[PDB]
Design an enzyme around this catalytic site. Structure first.
Site, PDB file in Angstrom:
ATOM      1  N   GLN A  81      20.967  70.057  -0.453  1.00  0.00           N
ATOM      2  CA  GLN A  81      19.948  69.149   0.069  1.00  0.00           C
ATOM      3  C   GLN A  81      18.772  69.105  -0.885  1.00  0.00           C
ATOM      4  O   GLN A  81      18.584  70.017  -1.695  1.00  0.00           O
ATOM      5  CB  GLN A  81      19.437  69.642   1.431  1.00  0.00           C
ATOM      6  CG  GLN A  81      20.504  69.830   2.482  1.00  0.00           C
ATOM      7  CD  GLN A  81      20.031  70.638   3.686  1.00  0.00           C
ATOM      8  OE1 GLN A  81      20.848  71.129   4.466  1.00  0.00           O
ATOM      9  NE2 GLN A  81      18.716  70.773   3.847  1.00  0.00           N
ATOM     10  N   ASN A  93      26.532  69.835  16.655  1.00  0.00           N
ATOM     11  CA  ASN A  93      27.037  70.308  15.370  1.00  0.00           C
ATOM     12  C   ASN A  93      27.866  71.572  15.618  1.00  0.00           C
ATOM     13  O   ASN A  93      27.324  72.673  15.733  1.00  0.00           O
ATOM     14  CB  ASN A  93      25.881  70.582  14.403  1.00  0.00           C
ATOM     15  CG  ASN A  93      26.355  71.107  13.046  1.00  0.00           C
ATOM     16  OD1 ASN A  93      27.554  71.237  12.794  1.00  0.00           O
ATOM     17  ND2 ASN A  93      25.408  71.389  12.165  1.00  0.00           N
ATOM     18  N   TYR A 130      28.859  70.574  -3.881  1.00  0.00           N
ATOM     19  CA  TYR A 130      28.630  69.538  -2.876  1.00  0.00           C
ATOM     20  C   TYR A 130      27.125  69.305  -2.668  1.00  0.00           C
ATOM     21  O   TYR A 130      26.353  70.260  -2.491  1.00  0.00           O
ATOM     22  CB  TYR A 130      29.348  69.910  -1.575  1.00  0.00           C
ATOM     23  CG  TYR A 130      29.245  68.858  -0.499  1.00  0.00           C
ATOM     24  CD1 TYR A 130      30.070  67.730  -0.511  1.00  0.00           C
ATOM     25  CD2 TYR A 130      28.313  68.985   0.524  1.00  0.00           C
ATOM     26  CE1 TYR A 130      29.955  66.757   0.484  1.00  0.00           C
ATOM     27  CE2 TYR A 130      28.196  68.039   1.511  1.00  0.00           C
ATOM     28  CZ  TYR A 130      29.018  66.924   1.484  1.00  0.00           C
ATOM     29  OH  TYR A 130      28.892  65.986   2.471  1.00  0.00           O
ATOM     30  N   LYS A 164      36.713  63.037   5.854  1.00  0.00           N
ATOM     31  CA  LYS A 164      35.328  63.445   5.588  1.00  0.00           C
ATOM     32  C   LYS A 164      34.707  64.070   6.833  1.00  0.00           C
ATOM     33  O   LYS A 164      34.832  63.520   7.937  1.00  0.00           O
ATOM     34  CB  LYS A 164      34.462  62.257   5.128  1.00  0.00           C
ATOM     35  CG  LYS A 164      33.057  62.656   4.624  1.00  0.00           C
ATOM     36  CD  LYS A 164      33.137  63.415   3.302  1.00  0.00           C
ATOM     37  CE  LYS A 164      31.765  63.906   2.838  1.00  0.00           C
ATOM     38  NZ  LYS A 164      31.383  65.215   3.504  1.00  0.00           N
ATOM     39  N   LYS A 171      28.550  58.899   3.622  1.00  0.00           N
ATOM     40  CA  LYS A 171      28.864  58.817   2.206  1.00  0.00           C
ATOM     41  C   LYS A 171      30.063  57.933   1.892  1.00  0.00           C
ATOM     42  O   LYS A 171      30.158  57.422   0.784  1.00  0.00           O
ATOM     43  CB  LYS A 171      29.074  60.213   1.603  1.00  0.00           C
ATOM     44  CG  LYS A 171      27.806  61.052   1.644  1.00  0.00           C
ATOM     45  CD  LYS A 171      28.080  62.511   1.303  1.00  0.00           C
ATOM     46  CE  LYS A 171      26.803  63.317   1.438  1.00  0.00           C
ATOM     47  NZ  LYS A 171      27.007  64.737   1.043  1.00  0.00           N
ATOM     48  N   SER A 212      27.090  63.129   6.933  1.00  0.00           N
ATOM     49  CA  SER A 212      27.713  62.865   5.626  1.00  0.00           C
ATOM     50  C   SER A 212      28.946  61.970   5.630  1.00  0.00           C
ATOM     51  O   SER A 212      29.395  61.584   4.559  1.00  0.00           O
ATOM     52  CB  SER A 212      28.092  64.160   4.935  1.00  0.00           C
ATOM     53  OG  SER A 212      26.938  64.865   4.520  1.00  0.00           O
ATOM     54  N   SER A 232      27.597  66.160   9.452  1.00  0.00           N
ATOM     55  CA  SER A 232      26.806  66.775  10.513  1.00  0.00           C
ATOM     56  C   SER A 232      25.346  66.434  10.354  1.00  0.00           C
ATOM     57  O   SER A 232      24.862  66.233   9.234  1.00  0.00           O
ATOM     58  CB  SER A 232      26.935  68.297  10.456  1.00  0.00           C
ATOM     59  OG  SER A 232      28.291  68.690  10.586  1.00  0.00           O
ATOM     60  N   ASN A 254      23.908  66.359  -1.397  1.00  0.00           N
ATOM     61  CA  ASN A 254      23.274  65.116  -0.952  1.00  0.00           C
ATOM     62  C   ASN A 254      22.474  64.410  -2.063  1.00  0.00           C
ATOM     63  O   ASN A 254      22.655  63.214  -2.267  1.00  0.00           O
ATOM     64  CB  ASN A 254      22.371  65.375   0.264  1.00  0.00           C
ATOM     65  CG  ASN A 254      23.145  65.570   1.561  1.00  0.00           C
ATOM     66  OD1 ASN A 254      24.372  65.609   1.583  1.00  0.00           O
ATOM     67  ND2 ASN A 254      22.412  65.696   2.659  1.00  0.00           N
ATOM     68  N   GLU A 266      37.814  62.610   0.553  1.00  0.00           N
ATOM     69  CA  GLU A 266      38.478  63.784  -0.007  1.00  0.00           C
ATOM     70  C   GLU A 266      39.908  63.796   0.507  1.00  0.00           C
ATOM     71  O   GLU A 266      40.139  63.565   1.691  1.00  0.00           O
ATOM     72  CB  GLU A 266      37.721  65.061   0.380  1.00  0.00           C
ATOM     73  CG  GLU A 266      36.280  65.081  -0.155  1.00  0.00           C
ATOM     74  CD  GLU A 266      35.436  66.241   0.366  1.00  0.00           C
ATOM     75  OE1 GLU A 266      36.005  67.259   0.834  1.00  0.00           O
ATOM     76  OE2 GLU A 266      34.183  66.141   0.287  1.00  0.00           O
TER      77      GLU A 266
END
Ligand code: ZX1
Ligand code: CL
Length: 360
Positions: free
Chosen positions: A118, A342, A149, A314, A65, A62, A317, A151, A271
């Site tokens: 997702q 991760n 939050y 940000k 993004k 992510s 993973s 995707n 953020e």
């Protein structure tokens, strides 16, 4: 003494966290006083013995993004779209759906009304299936009221930004965005010739894990990059004025906050937090409940410049990788932490905080 002290500080921050989280390989890059510093640890592949270097490619999940947001920033400052456009303005297939009543800003900042974390497992990487998914989706609550939050939320934002420019997202990234930013070690689709640089990812029982295709994968989590290239991107964010004006403006568009949730101010991709702030507060802002639960937003009266005494960050993973990026605009200070496991967000933030605290 300075080189010695920096190595000592970064080693002290990284090594216990790598050991505790059984991270096979980890790359750090720090931008300090206008110079890059690289620290590389462990193995890109446990099986073939390839070591991590500043050129090793990691999946950043992510964190992608922030690149997606930069492309949208380009569309915006080129007058091809506006943040207050309704989503269906940019894709006729969405006209007559609930996306008639949802803004591009809502999509970008996860406030469209409950788009999930997702895409469901049933939605494959296929334009028709993606189209049909959005056509049938209904908001759980009013657009513009709650952050969840997501995707598919920011993915659609990126996809529509590409449509507004009249070219595929993936092509715009490869042909325009990455070259504008000076990034030659940054890929959506790693070339065959560069596969030797691509780290192995590791999950449970050290099963090997590299990211597979999925719907709007490029927009949400598409990027594979090196610590050196990701730091180059951080440096572009620290000094957008060093780029040609259209790209300077694109980067600036990702440094504007629209609402707050707790300690966090939401921009496009980035953020932001006040700086200094406690480690525990920064961890809370990057925690599982923050990502997984809806939060009522506090809308700002006007967009807020995300600059000066703030930390922008940000997390990202994939199944086999964990990335974190943080920078402080008012201190010309940036860092990236890329790993091929991760491991918990709180641990990534702990490394970053130790490094930032030691530099201060
Ligand atoms: C991005 O990395 C998002 C979440 N971001 S975070 O800020 O909450 O860390 C974490 C996981 N994630 C994904 O994009 N996960 C995808 C899920 C799609 C299918 N597999 C690829 C990983
Ligand atoms: Cl997804």
């Amino acid at each position: 003494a300075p080189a010695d002290r920096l190595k000592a500080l970064v080693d002290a921050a990284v090594q216990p966290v790598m050991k505790a989280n059984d991270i096979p390989g980890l790359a750090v890059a720090i931008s300090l006083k206008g110079e890059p510093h690289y620290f590389s640890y462990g193995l890109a592949s446990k099986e073939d013995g390839r070591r991590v270097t500043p050129e090793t490619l990691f999946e950043i999940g992510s964190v992608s993004k922030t690149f997606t947001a930069t492309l949208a920033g380009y569309a915006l400052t080129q007058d091809k779209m506006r943040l207050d456009d309704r989503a269906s303005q940019h894709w006729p297939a969405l006209q007559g759906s609930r996306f008639d009543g949802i803004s591009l800003l809502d999509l970008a900042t996860y406030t469209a009304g409950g788009l999930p974390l997702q895409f469901p497992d049933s939605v494959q990487k296929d334009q028709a299936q993606i189209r049909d998914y959005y056509r049938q989706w209904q908001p759980t609550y009013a657009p513009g009221s709650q952050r969840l939050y997501s995707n598919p939320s920011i993915g659609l934002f990126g996809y529509l930004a590409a449509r507004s420019l009249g070219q595929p997202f993936e092509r715009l990234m490869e042909q325009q965005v990455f070259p504008a930013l000076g990034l030659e070690q940054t890929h959506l689709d790693v070339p065959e010739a560069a596969l030797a640089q691509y780290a192995q990812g590791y999950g449970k029982d050290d099963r090997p894990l590299r990211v597979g295709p999925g719907p709007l994968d490029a927009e949400g989590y598409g990027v594979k990059t090196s610590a050196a290239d990701l730091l180059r991107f951080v440096d572009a964010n620290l000094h957008p004025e060093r780029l040609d004006r259209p790209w300077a403006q694109a980067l600036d568009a990702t440094h504007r906050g629209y609402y707050k949730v707790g300690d966090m101010t939401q921009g496009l991709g980035w953020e932001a937090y006040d700086w200094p702030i406690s480690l525990k507060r920064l961890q809370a802002g990057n925690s599982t409940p923050m990502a997984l639960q809806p939060h009522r937003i506090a809308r700002l009266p006007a967009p807020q410049a995300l600059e000066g005494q703030r930390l922008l960050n940000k997390t990202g993973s994939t199944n086999g990788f964990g990335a974190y990026v943080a920078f402080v605009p008012g201190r010309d200070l940036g860092l990236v932490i890329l790993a091929n496991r991760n491991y918990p967000n709180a641990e990534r933030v702990k490394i970053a905080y130790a490094i930032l605290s030691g530099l201060e």
